Amino acid sequence: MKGMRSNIPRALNAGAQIACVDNTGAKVVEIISVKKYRGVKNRMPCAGIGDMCVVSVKKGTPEMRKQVLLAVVVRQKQEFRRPDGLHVSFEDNAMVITDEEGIPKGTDIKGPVAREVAERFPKIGTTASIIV
Amino acid sequence: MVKRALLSVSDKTGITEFARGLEALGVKIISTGGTAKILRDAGIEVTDVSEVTGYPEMMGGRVKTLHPRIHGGLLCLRESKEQMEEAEKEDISLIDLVAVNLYPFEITISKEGVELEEAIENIDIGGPTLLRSAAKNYRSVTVISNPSDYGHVLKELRSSGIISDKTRANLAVKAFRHTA
Amino acid sequence: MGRRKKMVERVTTLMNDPQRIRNIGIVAHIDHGKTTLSDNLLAGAGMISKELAGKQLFMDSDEEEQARGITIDSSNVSMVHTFDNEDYLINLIDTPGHVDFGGDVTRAMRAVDGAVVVVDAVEGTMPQTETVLRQALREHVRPVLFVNKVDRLINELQVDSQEMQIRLGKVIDHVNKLIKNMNPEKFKAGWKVDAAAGTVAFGSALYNWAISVPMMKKTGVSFKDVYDYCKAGDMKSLAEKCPLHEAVLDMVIHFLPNPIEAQKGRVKVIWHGDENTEIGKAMTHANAEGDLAFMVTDISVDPHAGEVATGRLFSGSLTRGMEVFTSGSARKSRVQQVGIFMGPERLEVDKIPAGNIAAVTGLKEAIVGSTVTTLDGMTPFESIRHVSEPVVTVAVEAKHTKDLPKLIEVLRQVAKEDPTLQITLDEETGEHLMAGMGELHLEVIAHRIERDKNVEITTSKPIVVYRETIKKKTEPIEGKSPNRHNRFYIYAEPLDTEIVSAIKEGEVSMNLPELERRQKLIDLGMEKEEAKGIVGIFNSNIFIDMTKGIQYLNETMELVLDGFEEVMRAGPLTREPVANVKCVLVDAKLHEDAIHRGPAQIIPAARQAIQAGMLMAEDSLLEPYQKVFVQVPQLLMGGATKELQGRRGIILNMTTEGDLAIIEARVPVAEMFGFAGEIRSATEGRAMWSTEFGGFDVVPSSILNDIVGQIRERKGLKKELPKASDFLSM
Amino acid sequence: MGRRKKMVERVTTLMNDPQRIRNIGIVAHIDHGKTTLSDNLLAGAGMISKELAGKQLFMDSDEEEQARGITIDSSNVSMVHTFDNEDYLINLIDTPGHVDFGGDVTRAMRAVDGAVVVVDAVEGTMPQTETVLRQALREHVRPVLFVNKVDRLINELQVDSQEMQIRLGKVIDHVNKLIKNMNPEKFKAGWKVDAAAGTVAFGSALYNWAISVPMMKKTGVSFKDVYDYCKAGDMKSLAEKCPLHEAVLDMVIHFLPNPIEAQKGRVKVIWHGDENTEIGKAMTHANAEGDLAFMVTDISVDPHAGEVATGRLFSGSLTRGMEVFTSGSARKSRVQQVGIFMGPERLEVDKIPAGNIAAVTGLKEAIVGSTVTTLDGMTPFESIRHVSEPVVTVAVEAKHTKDLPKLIEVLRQVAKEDPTLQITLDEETGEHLMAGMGELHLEVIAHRIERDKNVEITTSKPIVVYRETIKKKTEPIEGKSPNRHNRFYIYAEPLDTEIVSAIKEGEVSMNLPELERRQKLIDLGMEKEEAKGIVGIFNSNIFIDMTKGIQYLNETMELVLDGFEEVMRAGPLTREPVANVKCVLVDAKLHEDAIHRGPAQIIPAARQAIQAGMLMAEDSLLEPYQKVFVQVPQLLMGGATKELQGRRGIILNMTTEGDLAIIEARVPVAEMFGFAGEIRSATEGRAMWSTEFGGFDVVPSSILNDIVGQIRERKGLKKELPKASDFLSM
Amino acid sequence: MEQRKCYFCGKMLEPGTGKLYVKKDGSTYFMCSSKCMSNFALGRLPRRTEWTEKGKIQLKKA
RNA sequence: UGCUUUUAGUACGAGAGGAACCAAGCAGCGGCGCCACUGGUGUACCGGUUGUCUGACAAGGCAUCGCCGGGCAGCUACGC
């Protein structure tokens, strides 16, 4: 994918139940695997901001639930550094449902998104109300 | 299996637990009025009928509801296409469990004359319908009229997963009987 | 780059150009094509492509204003005029020139820094004219006279050049007298006017010719000559070289004070807050600062556009995406349309630092007269509420049974026109309870009915309705069941005034964190336990569940609640709505099974008890008051006041400023009838009253018996009522 | 008087100026430069303020073509080029000629005066080109040659000037050689092009440069000079010096016909109704005052202005407002707004006379195949119809278990995506039986799935949807209710093919006035009695109540017609919908009360009876056919014809147009499987085939039992033939 | 070079150091140090904390 | 060792579809080192506070460093 300007620690590993913060009907999704991630022996799949993960909808509408979907993490509590040396951290972790190409299934994103994801996937930025 | 539940119970006796159970088994609770209140005051999230029909609210506690064209979804098979599709339409929901009891009618006698006007006034019009509709579903929708059968239901679900035909039958019949 | 196509460009940056910015208003009389010359200032004077400019009187944001010779409401636009080779932004924010327009006129003046004068020839300083000069004086909005269409004096009446403008020299003198007598200090502070010095113009708006000593000289066509040319008949060709717009604009730039100067002026008097915070400073001493210091002048809208609530950027900056509060709550909405009223509309944009206008949208819950700002607005300008309803209406009838159908549309529709007219339109006999609380309200609609549709109906006398309430803490009354199986021991008592005000405001909401609400209640005063047991509230009455132990109760709550609600709709004393009454369920005793717990048994018990409770609790009655802002001529006070006081009106402020004694007294609507009627004799025919719902207070105990008596019969109720025991029939 | 507004008036003048109209078009092979040329033409003559176009692909006024780089379907735009000091309205027919189109091609070509063949300067004349050119010419649409993409040769393939023109010459040759093989009579009427005759241009749409022999001379710019600029980065200069729009519009007007002339030969070729008929002469020789001719070819459903049908005003002036008709669907709708097309948008104008595509709103009788008329029953250019229903279904499954959700939604969109299928979206088994109109259509859609959404899925063996059919006239069969209190003596018999057709046509309805309907049927064939006694029409089935004087039948009706429709939806044999079946009720013994006439008793009897009858009347199946059209080379006919013959290919025409053996036949849909492959395979890849629903036909009795058994099995039924015996139980 | 102020202590963020903390409602706060971040997360207020500039302002208000 | 951009919607192909050399960035894993930044620890240290003892205050002992909050150096990775 296109490189991000910031250095992102892959903070969320497989099994994490993240709140889903768009209007698709998924409330909580559990990370199953990370796309484009090859691991090593004994290492759980890891994801930071800007990564696309395969998720399972654990809470939300009954139509969304139990579906294997693609999501992009837009907020992470683990601090990441911008190129100019400033460290950024969010109050929670948050993801949004998308396709393979990166288009969000939802139409509006409640909460701030990271500028890194906003630039890597421009449609997430337009869908989000504010980009931090 | 139960995915959504319409809990418009006049008599609220023990609805809190049934609700808790369903929620814990994912079952979204689409309820309105008294029930809805108690449930949201007892730590159970409940969606309102407003987010189903296109009918707001008025004199919550008896009628205010119904479901035309649309009741034919739950009807006698909330999965039978021709049947199914009707109840879920535009933002509507495919509730597969409805529990609607009806407060027993009573006229009594007041100090100044039989209170006919109000007494008769409170003849639940919505409730009974929801019942008959759901009830007809000898399959799909599992009607829970009588309040003294939340246990049986819960247990079955928690275990088995699907309220057996036998049970569905008993329940439905009982509902029809209640309206009778 | 088609005219406004260029403007757009310049404008977007012009925002942060206070030096050249010119947010001003126009105040005078009506029937002088004042709003039409202002149509032509920019729309007329093609500030956009001519086809898309003033062709169809579109200039004003509030399009409907059109032209009647004066502003209709408070519509807005902008015009980038050039003066001495410089494009000044004359944001035209023509101020409503009337008198009835009130608490809103305040902010409709705050939107500008100078209201301007326009008086057609020998029309003179009409009563209204002086009234708007008085209103102007408040918001420190310097004026410049614009004697419109002198044609009358000229062509029609033919008063020789010199005379012609000497009459106006005196009129100018009267405008000086206004700015002297009224507020003497005001004068020297720029508010002074003069044709000679240039701070006064003249000219026919309908013929678009116009001049003023500055103009006069510059153009080379002195007023004398202009008279000769008008008289002759070439006022159109005159207009050509003396563009109606030009004059006005010229003066706004030069003479008419540039905003910056009296950027402060207004605030202090107009603003009721701390005029010394970042916001205060900016709004006063022409600066930006003040964390988005927008002011909802008038909640507006536009089809597929935004909630274009007007508010000239008197301080701050604009941008798209600002979580802005309100002067009512903390809504916090995306502010996409931070644009500037331009061309014949409101050019939506974003980058707008303080200077020009600042109509923000993205909202849908504020109030016309708020002050929506990102900054935590401590005391914004018109920090106010709105919770009110008319309580003394009438019974609109039908002189002819043939107009009934029409009447039907007329009245059902009127809601659209005015939602403050809660048209309690009964259906059987059809005694249409057309809203109202006072004589004003009554006639207010009177004409409307017989003018916007025209019907042969009539009215009856004031429906003296109020709000039932009590005043004494009672002792637990038991409300048994029909089938003598259940029971409920409820007590009733006065609803504390602080609490009352609280829920009158509305903040105490059912959809609200328990813990939170609870604290608030304790804060007010209600002890912890009681404050936590609160189940529901109707109107301005609260039901408290301060019981412990009764099994299967909250499954009955529904019923009991409703019972309460019912009583709250119909008093136990006068069968009138109940308000400001706290009810508290102490104990209860419900039957084991559900069979003997149906509405038919519960509801009665509750009703019964609550009612009786009220009765025993020295049930009285409240009565609406209506604050009478009465701008009697300064001198006049003895008679003015005497009137009010005599009509049991608890005197308030006398408001003596210059030559204006605004004696408010929150006159009890009871005796708030025929105010103007009395006035015309009391103050020798000289007083301008105006009223506003003063609030629900206690009806004088002395006259209770009388009041009740009347109400009872007026509705058609037995003289005596079920005294305690009887209604509590065991 | 803006430049645009002056052009707007010009527009109207030209509208009522038929001699100065040029309804042209663009015809080329995929990725040759259609969209490119189009949009850059629009901008080339600068009809709109340049910026407006480009980014927002104008010619591509829809949404599909808007991401391709080559034109796809219809719509239109406008140009007004100045030629020898004279402007001309140039309508620009969008081109729906992409190989993925059948009737649409025709439709547009029957609205295009002439076109522009655009041949890639490298790839040369291509299959697509051939197809489009020959088609258009067949429908008499003179073209000109604009060899685009010269830039590539000049630079990329570093060819030299001399070679450049050698290659282009060879192209010119190829072009005409084909034209020749297409229509020697038209090649004798000199439509063939040549740049020396100005009918061929040379340029690059992507760079907006273009030259042609005439202009070449006029300006002095020669092929060698061109080559020099191109090699020396002077394509900017090129463009400016010799614009693209320039050369193109010259061909488009100087050598391309106008409405009038075009209309003449067009009507002569396409239309078949006697030209002496008024409508005829009217649209032949330019006349809009006659019978309305407005073949809707597009339905620009303006989201904020309703359905805006775009058709060429072959005849019929468009004075504001007109109640009219159409071809085929000649009902009674009106004509409100009639906007013309300026730029790519809709400029609302009043009266449009001849040869001027207009968009009309408020048109219920207005779609493809419908030529909106004001003369009822309008004659046909090329006969059309309107019926088309799924006949070939596949069971779209979801192999990838992690795709079901996605699949569900993807096909939930497929509905409007392509309104020709009827997926039976289910959850029981997960197999979405997508019912398409054609094996190829199916294949195409299915492919599109795992391509534009990419759901890892497939589709299983396509199956044909048959109809159940009776054979003879039956003998009254008693249908008894369970309780025996009702008896329904009823019989059935084949439905008259004439009546079948007209019912499928829709005219005959059950919502039709007795008189009206009856008449139609009466002449069509339905014996008066029956026509008067009909009470229902379902697809191709009717229940003729031919009884008289039966008590309680009037009411009873409903339940019986219920049973009727049930049985008709699935016949007792192959459980397929019944078709071509007319029932005659002969006796109705009924119980007096309704207790013994409740639906649960009526419905059974009727059902039972009808089914039993059907089976006794040698129930067969109807197999749909699918009219084949094979645009293949002349030579190629041996294997082709033998193939269809082996596949029951009823040849109804063979159009051996010179070097092209366009065989037109009819082959049974079921037997169309594989044909796709074999046709081209055998004919060395030279077989452009296309089909279309050839009408249900009484399945060849040959192996009826076989086909039946197959169906039985597939749909999991019993192996004992559903013997009428049982249905007509005791 | 963006000049940033610590939300808690009111000190300028030195370039190449410090943190930005974002809440769910989009509210952003600059923190000069882990100390300031911890005190903000404890619910302590700067105006009540004496070593910060807001605490100093509150005290000098008297 | 992959992804993305470019080559290039180009060669090829009737279309659909769709490459390669060179170039750039990023990423996964591995290796080596480092501690300006950020995180952890930090039984140096500072403060708050519970129970108790030294008579009270102050100053101290003990209760896992009593517990709780903060934390420099050092080490470290989750950082570079």
Report DSSP letters for D617-673, one per residue. Answer: TT-EEEEEEEEEEEE-BSS--HHHHHHHHHTT-EEEE----TTB--EEEEEEGGGGT
Q: Rounded CA gap, C15 and C21, in Å? A: 8
Q: Rounded CA gap, C579 and C494, in Å? A: 10
| Phi, psi dihedral angles at D217 (to 5 degrees) | -55, -65
Q: Which of D146, D4, D163, D21 has its CA nearest to residue D92?
A: D21
- Give CA angle at D339 (D337, D344), nearest 5°: 145
Tell me the shortest Cα–Cα distance from B15 to chain A, in angstroms.
Answer: 22
Q: If you compute the radius of gyration of chain B from its CA atoms, what whole number of angstroms results?
A: 16
CB A67 within 8 A of CB A40: no
Q: Rounded CA gap, D35 and D57, in Å? A: 8
Amino acid occupying residue B172: A
**Partners of residue C146 on adjacent β-strands:** C201
D151 is in an annotated binding site: yes
Regarding chains B and E, contact by 3 or more CB pairs under 8 A is answered as: no
Structure tokens given for C246: 């030009």
DSSP, collapsed to helix, strand or coil, labels residue D595 as: helix
Which of strand F's nucleotides are less than 7 A from any protein C-beta? 2-5, 9-11, 13-17, 25-30, 36-40, 69-72, 78-80
Q: Rounded CA gap, D100 and D30, in Å? A: 11
CA of A87 to C1' of F37 (A): 9
CB pair distance less than 8 Å for A89 and E20: yes
Q: Which of D110, D87, D97 has its CA nearest to residue D27?
A: D97
Which residues of chain A make contact with C321, given a CB cutoff of 8 A?
129-130
D contact chains, 3+ CB pairs < 8 A: A, B, C
**Partners of residue C650 on adjacent β-strands:** none
- First and final C-alpha spacing in chain A: 21
| Phi, psi dihedral angles at C178 (to 5 degrees) | -55, -55
Residues in chain A: 132
- Contacts of residue D368, defined as CB under 8 A and 6 or more positions apart, other chains included, come to D103, D104, D107, D296, D297, D299
Name the DSSP class of B91.
Answer: S
CA of D680 to C1' of F15 (A): 14
Q: Rounded CA gap, B130 and C150, in Å? A: 77
Structure tokens given for C454: 């025209």
Whether residue D426 lies within 8 A of chain B, CB to CB, comes out as yes
Tell me the shortest Cα–Cα distance from D302 to chain C, in angstroms.
Answer: 16
Strand F-contacting residues in A 62-101, CB cut-off 7 angstroms: 79, 81, 85, 87
Biggest alpha carbon–alpha carbon distance for chain E: 37
Q: Rounded CA gap, C634 and C641, in Å? A: 12
Q: Which of D600, D560, D601 has its CA nearest to residue D583?
A: D560
CA of D207 to C1' of F13 (A): 26
CA of E4 to C1' of F34 (A): 29
Name the DSSP class of D253.
Answer: I
Q: Rounded CA gap, D159 and D167, in Å? A: 10
CB C307 within 8 A of CB C299: yes
Cβ-based contacts under 8 A for chains A and C: 3
Give the CA count within 13 Å in the CB-facing half-sphere of D65: 27
Amino acid occupying residue D723: K
Structure tokens given for D725: 């015996």
Q: Rounded CA gap, D615 and C445, in Å? A: 78
CB C477 within 8 A of CB C612: yes
Which residues of chain A make contact with D454, given a CB cutoff of 8 A?
100
**Partners of residue D200 on adjacent β-strands:** D145
CA of E28 to C1' of F67 (A): 34
CB C423 within 8 A of CB C411: yes
Q: Rounded CA gap, E51 and E49, in Å? A: 6
Name the DSSP class of D21.
Answer: B
Q: Which of C531, C595, C518, C22 has its CA nearest to residue C255?
A: C22
CA of C480 to C1' of F4 (A): 79
Find the nucleotide nearest A10 (Cα to C1′).
F78
Structure tokens given for D289: 């005052």
Amino acid occupying residue D239: A
Q: Is the CB of D677 under 7 A from strand F?
A: no
Task: Return the HEC string of C419-442.
Answer: CCCCCECCCCCCCCECCCCCHHHH
DSSP, collapsed to helix, strand or coil, labels residue B54 as: coil
Q: Rounded CA gap, C399 and C459, in Å? A: 10
Q: Which of C629, C648, C647, C643 has its CA nearest to residue C694?
A: C629
Residue with tokens 């697509």: D128
C151 is in an annotated binding site: yes
Q: Is the CB of D206 under 7 A from strand F?
A: no
Q: What share of chain D is helix, strand, coil (3-state, %, to 5)?
A: 35, 20, 40
Which residues of chain B make contact with C600, given a CB cutoff of 8 A?
105-108, 115, 118-119, 122
CB A79 within 8 A of CB A88: yes
Q: Which of D681, D675, D688 has its CA nearest to residue D633?
A: D688
Task: Return the HEC string of D97-127.
Answer: CCCCCCHHHHHHHCCCCCEEEECCCCCCCCH
CA dihedral over E37, E39, E40, E46, signed as positive or negative = negative
CA dihedral over C46, C51, C55, C56, signed as positive or negative = negative
CB C627 within 8 A of CB C666: yes
Q: Rounded CA gap, D579 and B106, in Å? A: 58
Find the nucleotide nearest D444 (Cα to C1′).
F16
Name the DSSP class of C354.
Answer: B
Q: Which of D613, D720, D714, D726 has its CA nearest to residue D670?
A: D714
- Chain A, 44 to 103: residues with Cβ < 8 Å from chain E are 75, 79, 84-92
C98 is in an annotated binding site: yes
Q: Rounded CA gap, D600 and A118, in Å? A: 63
Name the DSSP class of B74.
Answer: T
- From the list B37, B41, B61, which residue is nearest C562 (CB)? B61
Q: Rounded CA gap, C90 and C77, in Å? A: 9
Q: Is the CB of E58 under 7 A from strand F?
A: no
CB pair distance less than 8 Å for B12 and C555: yes
CB B168 within 8 A of CB B7: no
Q: Which of D105, D120, D169, D109 has its CA nearest to residue D143?
A: D109
Q: Rounded CA gap, C291 and C369, in Å? A: 19
Q: Which of C64, C693, C3 has its CA nearest to residue C392?
A: C693
Find the nucleotide nearest D685 (Cα to C1′).
F14
Q: Rounded CA gap, A11 and D470, in Å? A: 71
CA dihedral over C614, C617, C618, C622, signed as positive or negative = negative
- Chain D, 136 to 155: residues with Cβ < 8 Å from chain B are none
- Give CA angle at D467 (D465, D473), nearest 5°: 170
Which contacts qualify for A17-20: CB closer than 8 Å, 24 or more apart? Answer: A17/A58, A18/A55, A18/A71, A18/A73, A18/A93, A18/A94, A18/A95, A19/A92, A19/A93, A19/A94, A19/A95, A20/A57, A20/A60, A20/A71, A20/A94, A20/A95, A20/A96, A20/A97
CB C238 within 8 A of CB C6: no
Q: Which of D501, D503, D467 has its CA nearest to residue D619?
A: D467
Whether residue C598 lies within 8 A of chain B, CB to CB, comes out as yes
Using N-to-C axis directions, what is the helix angle for C638-646 and C675-682, rounded to 10°? 140
CB C326 within 8 A of CB C365: yes
DSSP string, C129-161: HHHHHHHHHHTT----EEEE-TTIIIIIT--TH
E35 is in an annotated binding site: no
CB D457 within 8 A of CB D398: yes
CA of D450 to C1' of F19 (A): 21
- Give CA angle at C709 (C707, C710), nearest 5°: 65
Structure tokens given for D176: 């005409």
Q: Which of C318, C311, C279, C312 has its CA nearest to residue C297?
A: C311
Q: Which of C505, C406, C420 has its CA nearest to residue C452?
A: C406
Residues in chain D: 730
Q: Is the CB of E12 under 7 A from strand F?
A: no
Structure tokens given for D621: 């199946």
Distances (CA, A) of B178 to A56, B74, B145: 42, 19, 7
Residue with tokens 């529990």: B99
Q: Rounded CA gap, C566 and C578, in Å? A: 10
Q: Rounded CA gap, E7 and E36, in Å? A: 8
Whether residue C535 lies within 8 A of chain B, CB to CB, comes out as no
Which residues of chain C make contact with D2, given a CB cutoff of 8 A?
2, 49, 51
Distances (CA, A) of C117 to C43, C498, D388, D635: 20, 46, 74, 94
Find the nucleotide nearest D156 (Cα to C1′).
F10
Q: Which of D721, A114, B61, B124 has its CA nearest to residue C559?
A: B61
CB pair distance less than 8 Å for B109 and C598: no
Q: Rounded CA gap, C610 and C108, in Å? A: 48
DSSP string, A7-73: B----EETT-EEEB-BSSSEEEEEEEEETT----TTPPPEE-TT-EEEEEEEEE-TTTTT-EEEEEE
CB D355 within 8 A of CB D295: no
CA of D40 to C1' of F10 (A): 22
Q: What share of chain C is helix, strand, coil (3-state, %, to 5)?
A: 35, 10, 55
CB pair distance less than 8 Å for A63 and D402: no
Helices and strands, number each (H, E), in chain C = 21, 18
Find the nucleotide nearest D98 (Cα to C1′).
F15
Helix runs in B25-164, H state only: 34-40, 68-71, 116-121, 126-135, 150-158
Amino acid occupying residue D627: K
Distances (CA, A) of A12 to A68, A76, D81, D442, E40: 18, 8, 64, 44, 25
Strand F-contacting residues in D 437-466, CB cut-off 7 angstroms: 447, 451
Q: Is the CB of D685 under 7 A from strand F?
A: yes
C656 is in an annotated binding site: no
**Partners of residue E20 on adjacent β-strands:** A88, E30
Find the nucleotide nearest D680 (Cα to C1′).
F14
- Decide: residue B111, CB within 10 A, 0-12 exposed, 13-18 middle, 19+ buried: middle
CB pair distance less than 8 Å for D426 and B81: yes
Residue with tokens 């209604």: C727
D479 is in an annotated binding site: no
Which residues of chain A make contact with C335, given a CB cutoff of 8 A?
none
Whether residue D2 lies within 8 A of chain C, CB to CB, comes out as yes
CB burial of D106-133 (b: ≥16 within 10 Å; e: otherwise) equals bbbbbbbbbbbbbbbbeebbbebbbbbb
Q: How many CB atoms lie within 10 A of CB C295?
A: 29
Q: If you compute the radius of gyration of chain A from its CA atoms, what whole number of angstroms results?
A: 14
**Partners of residue D689 on adjacent β-strands:** D630
DSSP string, D302-371: ETTTEEEEEE--SB----S---B--SS----B----EEEEETTEEE--S---SS--EEEES-SS-STT-E
| Phi, psi dihedral angles at D283 (to 5 degrees) | -70, -25
CB C585 within 8 A of CB C564: no
Q: Rounded CA gap, D655 and D30, in Å? A: 26
- Contacts of residue D556, defined as CB under 8 A and 6 or more positions apart, other chains included, come to D588, D590, D597, D602
